[PDB]
Design a protein around this ligand. Structure first.
Ligand code: HCY
Length: 361
């Protein structure tokens, strides 16, 4: 099924990226990556198609996959007083190219994708056009997404605004030490609430964790590993671990200290995808025959960018992907050191956002 395959891709992508850049702040939107690459698969055939779908975790009909993302795209459109969420897709195309009927019909039906004309000869204008488009769609959260000129650009964006069901106490906020390294300490606004919170001191892993809900169906896990045990906890991240945590989490009195995190990241997913076995996309042997017949295309660059804001009232997260194609007693829990964030949807089981916070500033 889609829900199982998507979350397994989420953790594997996270793990591989963590290993590739071990000191960087990692904040990603796996569902964004899965939806963008699944939309791409509609334009692939042969060995490239099979390799992409298998890498995404799908047992190779294709219609089941795209109906699944159509389902997600619909449920992820919300605009209320305490909950706001949007998700979308777009295709930027040079005038020299024309999409095949079935491909453009499929991306518009299943992914509600806009197909927008573009002059790749003027890259300054082109990259300005795409950057502003993404900027507006994510409510100004994703700024300056754009690397090298390209005749086709595939885009996906996600914006999320959640409100804590248990908000942090504004008066309780103080500046605390956040210990980045053995030689690095930064000052950060540290939030505090003393509430009945779902808590688990893990006995099978060197970590302690809490679960908090947002107004609606959004939920978040904050995982604090024991000092120097970040990679032992990360390697264990799976469906079986999150299930056991969910079953283990018990209502407890917690003095919960989490910092006011404002982080961003830009990630070239080239090395990550090829580590996961998705390699044909980038080769001069790439099969992109269902996109267009006006040119044989390969992928030149795959980039993801995401931003995270945490405060006393809630969370504001946003993400964007682009693909360029060219011609072929209270328990004190203090998050004052590197920790893990997992934002999920209760309703669909979708991994919305994953984080490894090395430095909240
Ligand atoms: C593994 C699981 C069910 C099987 C599956 O294919 C996908 C997932 C990933 C997300 C998990 C989910 C369930 O376990 C319920 C979880 C933990 C959910 C995230 C939040 C959740 O809904 C709860 O926290 C339950 O209250």
């Amino acid at each position: 099924g889609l829900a199982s395959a998507n979350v397994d891709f989420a953790f594997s992508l996270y793990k591989h990226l963590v290993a590739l850049s071990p000191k960087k702040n990692i904040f990603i939107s796996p569902v964004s990556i899965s939806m963008a690459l699944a939309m791409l698969s509609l334009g692939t055939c042969g060995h490239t198609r099979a390799q992409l779908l298998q890498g995404l975790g799908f047992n190779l009909s294709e219609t089941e996959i795209h109906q699944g993302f159509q389902h997600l795209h619909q449920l992820f459109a919300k605009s209320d007083t305490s909950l706001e969420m949007t998700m979308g897709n777009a295709l930027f195309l040079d005038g020299s190219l024309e999409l095949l009927e079935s491909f453009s019909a499929d991306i518009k039906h299943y992914y509600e994708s806009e197909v927008l004309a573009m002059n790749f000869q003027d890259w300054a204008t082109a990259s300005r056009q795409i950057n502003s488009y993404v900027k507006n769609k994510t409510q100004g959260k994703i700024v300056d997404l754009f690397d090298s000129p390209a005749i086709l650009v595939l885009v996906n964006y996600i914006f999320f605004k959640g409100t804590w069901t248990q908000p942090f106490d504004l008066a309780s906020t103080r500046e605390e030490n956040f210990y980045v390294d053995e030689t690095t300490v930064v000052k950060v606004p540290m939030m505090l609430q003393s509430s009945t919170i779902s808590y688990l001191h893990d006995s099978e892993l060197p970590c302690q964790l809490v679960q908090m809900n947002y107004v609606g169906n959004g939920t978040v896990f904050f995982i604090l590993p024991d000092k120097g045990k970040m990679n032992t906890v990360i390697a264990a991240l799976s469906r079986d671990t999150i299930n056991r945590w969910s079953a283990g989490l018990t209502s407890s009195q917690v003095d919960l200290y989490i910092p006011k995190v404002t982080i961003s990241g830009v990630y070239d997913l080239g090395d990550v995808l090829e580590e996961m076995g998705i390699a044909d996309l980038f080769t001069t042997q790439a099969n992109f025959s269902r996109i267009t017949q006006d040119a044989q295309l390969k992928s030149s660059k795959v980039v993801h960018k995401a931003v995270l804001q945490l405060n006393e009232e809630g969370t504001e997260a946003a993400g964007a992907m682009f693909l360029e194609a060219i011609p072929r007693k209270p328990i004190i829990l203090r998050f004052n050191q590197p920790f893990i964030i997992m934002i999920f949807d209760h309703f669909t089981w979708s991994s919305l956002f994953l984080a490894r916070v090395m430095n909240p500033v």
